[PDB]
């Protein structure tokens, strides 16, 4: 039958908590579940996995497909609920999460996954090394 190599003893009352690190870039999206430690990785999905076009990598369609794959795969690991840690590229780069951010967050719960505590961890310089732009930034 079904041998789920996820946790031994559960109940219908019980909550099984995984953690979802979600990275949204203008160029892509990452939906990554692990345990509460962050050490042992459970599921991994990138937009680029879900589409063949380099430009679509970030898009909501891709984020959605990614999400549903993740959910389907947690479901058999017996995982009800993910905590969410959201991230943009951050550091010296932009701190605005990409387009896939919202879409993936939604599609996760849309898929009948409970949702735990939500935090934004975007890397935040106390202070920075110097930015990849020119002195004058991107012209055009």
């Amino acid at each position: 039958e079904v041998i789920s190599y996820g946790p031994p003893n559960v109940g219908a009352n019980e909550n099984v908590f995984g953690v979802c690190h979600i990275m949204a870039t203008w160029n892509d999206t990452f939906i990554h579940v692990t345990d509460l430690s962050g050490r042992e990785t459970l599921v991994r999905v990138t937009g680029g996995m879900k589409v063949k076009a380099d430009r679509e990598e970030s898009s909501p369609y891709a984020a959605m497909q990614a999400a549903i794959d993740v959910v389907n795969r947690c479901k058999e690991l017996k995982i009800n609920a993910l905590h969410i840690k959201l991230r943009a590229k951050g550091g010296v780069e932009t701190k605005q999460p990409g387009p896939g951010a919202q879409s993936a967050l939604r599609a996760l719960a849309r898929s009948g996954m409970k949702i735990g505590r939500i935090e934004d961890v975007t890397p935040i310089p106390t202070d920075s090394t110097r930015r990849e732009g020119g002195r004058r930034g991107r012209r055009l």
Binding site: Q96, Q102, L105, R106, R110, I118, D120, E132, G137, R138
Partner: protein, 100 residues
């Protein structure tokens, strides 16, 4: 023809002010000159909000979804192009606390 008396930057009583990279481009801009708007938005479309608030595991949340805090700093070319700020007539040009 001096255009602004301010000359665009809020700086007086000093020689030099720290330069900030523009959010949009990354061009260095004066911290006085920069068009800076602090943004508290929500991470999620209101519809998407409904969907998530259904599935929130801890019912002890009252507005228990975080807001997204941005300190947004625009170089001038960017904040003009991007409509954050836009061209106004000479008289209005000096108006200081405008919004709603």
């Amino acid at each position: 023809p001096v255009k602004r008396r301010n000359a665009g930057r809020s700086q007086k009583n000093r020689g030099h002010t720290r330069t900030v990279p523009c959010t949009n481009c990354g061009r260095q801009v004066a911290k006085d000159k920069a068009v800076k708007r602090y943004t508290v938005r929500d991470m999620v479309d209101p519809s998407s909000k409904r969907d998530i608030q259904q599935k929130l595991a801890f019912e002890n949340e009252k507005q228990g979804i975080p807001k997204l805090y941005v300190k947004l700093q625009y170089c001038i070319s960017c904040a003009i192009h991007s409509r954050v700020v836009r061209v106004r007539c000479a008289e209005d040009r000096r108006i200081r606390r405008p919004p709603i």
